[PDB]
């Protein structure tokens, strides 16, 4: 109700949804009154939208003589608010200013699905930067959805490769109840089973389950302890933290190695307070290095000179808990006035996903550029072929789109509009006495695994045989070494002529 927009004029207008405010509380969810202003997921992504469009307009190589504008709306990280604002996007399209050509975001995969179900109807291509659900890969259900992030399937794939490179052929599995945990754990099960890796037993739990529940989970994990020591955890951070708290409660710290998903990448809010339990853990962290020019632009911003971000003044007065004296959006209830010495440089922390926001914006730009070159060959600008822009053709060109990203990464979409994954493998090492910190140990680039080795742990069910493998009603990795007859030769690992005698190798 009663929402402002951040707009910028241009020949082509690109929409975007960012959670500039927290989602409503359960009382005010029906009134859709959102919470406080958000800096990293909000203000910074908004300013990045604006300044990246500035840069692309100033780029002569990319869309020459074509200006890109934008309509930026507040999603509140909530599906009701997001659907509201997307209806506001297609408002003008219904009656038949400057309709929306594409949309950037939103953040949550569920909210992204809700927005996609509406955007697909009016053939509006959507490019997301943090929604990683595998559900979004089905292009019969989400035809105009594309993302510049790898799906959770890539996290499962990278963990399977990590398990391969350390001969961890028998491991336990825990995942968090929900879309993330179950989708990722199913992908892990499939990929590890195809690679000859066995699961002792798979478990599932919510982060909010009691100390009761995590104690039961840790005891059941101990049930497998002699053989399966590595616990592949496709888990959001608080599940890992609960396992660490259970390891504290039972005194079982350091009898397992946890293989964490991106839900616990280098998040200190998970290991803080229980570092000693978590030491030795290996995690996956989505690689996204900081963008320098965004800091250059953003840190210079003053509320007196920001004449295009409507939320920037409540943001400023909430950041330094002061009162902008005599300003249009001056807020009372602050007990001090804002100094001219206040700067955003003070305790600055760039958004973790900034590179992905910027790459989604560049994806939209390069798609428009390639469409322009295919429909208006001899032109430098919009010809009548792109008046108006056919969302079908824009999707067709975006699926073909391919650039070099903000950090040098070549950005590219597969037949499902999915982007390849580059994560960095972290180790939560003990850095001396009473200091614990995450350490970059490796890199996983779209299947190519490189690890800065010698930084062991054995998790196998059975040892290799000498001269055949035979299995009971149990799993393929748990075998018994049964010898063969004197006239028999080893055909293969699992299964065992006249005038000849078995060779000295028993081949």
């Amino acid at each position, epitope marked *: *109700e*009663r929402r*402002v927009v951040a707009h910028m004029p241009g020949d082509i207008i690109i929409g975007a949804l960012f959670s500039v405010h927290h989602q409503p509380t359960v009382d005010k969810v029906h009134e859709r009154k959102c919470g406080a202003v958000r800096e990293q997921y909000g203000i910074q992504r908004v300013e990045a939208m604006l300044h990246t469009l500035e840069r692309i307009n100033s780029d002569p190589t990319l869309l020459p003589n074509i200006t890109l504008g934008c309509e930026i709306r507040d999603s509140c990280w909530h599906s009701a608010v997001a659907l509201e604002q997307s209806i506001e996007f297609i408002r003008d399209s219904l009656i038949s200013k400057k309709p929306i050509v594409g949309v950037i975001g939103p953040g949550s995969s569920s909210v992204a699905i809700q927005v996609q179900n509406l955007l697909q109807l009016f053939n509006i291509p959507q490019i997301a930067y943090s929604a990683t659900s595998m559900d979004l890969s089905d292009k019969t259900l989400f035809k105009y959805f594309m993302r510049v992030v790898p799906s959770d399937a890539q996290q499962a794939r990278a963990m399977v490769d990590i398990v391969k490179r350390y001969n961890w052929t028998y491991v336990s599995a825990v995942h968090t109840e929900g879309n993330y945990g179950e989708s990722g754990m199913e992908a892990f099960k499939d990929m590890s089973a195809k690679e000859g890796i066995c699961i002792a037993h798979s478990y599932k739990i919510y982060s909010n389950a009691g100390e009761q529940s995590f104690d039961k989970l840790l005891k059941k994990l101990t049930s497998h302890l002699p053989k399966a020591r590595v616990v592949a955890c496709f888990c959001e951070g608080m599940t890992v933290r609960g396992l660490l708290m259970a390891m504290r409660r039972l005194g079982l710290a350091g009898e397992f190695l946890l293989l964490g998903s991106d839900g616990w990448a280098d998040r200190y809010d998970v290991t803080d307070g229980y570092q000693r339990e978590a030491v030795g853990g290996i995690t996956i962290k989505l690689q996204s290095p900081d963008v320098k020019w965004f800091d250059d632009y953003y840190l210079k911003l003053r509320p*007196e000179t*920001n*004449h*295009r971000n*409507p939320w920037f*003044q409540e943001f400023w007065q909430h950041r330094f808990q002061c009162r902008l*004296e*005599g*300003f*249009p*959006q*001056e*807020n*009372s209830k602050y007990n001090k006035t804002c100094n001219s010495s206040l700067t955003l440089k003070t305790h600055h922390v760039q958004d973790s996903k900034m590179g992905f926001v910027i790459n989604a914006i560049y994806s939209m730009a390069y798609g428009l550029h390639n469409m322009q070159m295919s429909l208006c060959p001899g032109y430098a600008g919009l010809c009548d072929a792109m008046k108006p822009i056919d969302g079908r053709k824009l999707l067709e060109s975006l699926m073909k789109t391919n650039f070099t990203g903000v950090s040098g990464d070549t950005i590219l979409f597969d037949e499902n509009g999915d982007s390849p994954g580059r994560y960095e493998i972290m180790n939560f090492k003990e850095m001396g006495k009473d200091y614990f910190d995450y350490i970059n140990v490796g890199s996983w680039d779209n299947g190519e695994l490189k690890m800065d080795d010698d930084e062991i742990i054995r998790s196998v069910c059975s040892e290799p045989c000498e001269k055949k493998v035979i299995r009971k009603g149990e799993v393929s990795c748990c075998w018994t070494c049964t010898p063969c007859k004197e006239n028999e030769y080893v055909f293969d690992e699992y299964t065992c002529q006249l005038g000849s005698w078995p060779t000295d190798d028993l081949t």
Partner: nanobody
Amino acid sequence: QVQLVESGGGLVQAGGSLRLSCAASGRTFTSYAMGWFRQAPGKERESVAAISSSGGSTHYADSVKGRFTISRDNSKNTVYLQMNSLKPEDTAVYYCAAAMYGSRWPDWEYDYWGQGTQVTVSS
């Protein structure tokens, strides 16, 4: 686009009181700070009063402090200028303006203007 429409002006005997109303169109009103202006013939336009988007933060020019009070009803999308102790040197067309960004008043970036209502202060 937002529309601003003034009303309440007319002829008023000096030393009297007069209340100007500014009605806005659109549900964005609660997001705009408001300012009153006045243009007298042969004189440059001056700022009279201003109020922030939330209300509860009012600013007045030195020539009208202690006589005018600016207010706003957000449930009605209306701004109000109560003018007391009217002097003949107040006779002018009063305008209503909406601004969203800007520095300390009167240095605001006014995005929308009204048509204006005449206030004639007879002696």
